[PDB]
Design a protein around this ligand. Sequence first.
Ligand SMILES: [Zn+2]
Lengths: 56, 11
Amino acid sequence: TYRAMYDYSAQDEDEVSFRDGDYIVNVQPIDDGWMYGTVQRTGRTGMLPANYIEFV
Amino acid sequence: PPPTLPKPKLP
Ligand SMILES: [Zn+2]
């Protein structure tokens, strides 16, 4: 589990939107820019920008 | 918020 540090609006069909403070669960790093995860609040799963989220 | 980096088409 990670927590968003900023709001983000998805920019492609494989991305998910979230808000500052959102818990992100079952996070898997993909590369240095992107991770997979589920936005707990909305229940949506997809790609998130890694630089918007912080571990724990 | 900061810029995002290029996406990867996986894998
Ligand atoms: Zn698209």
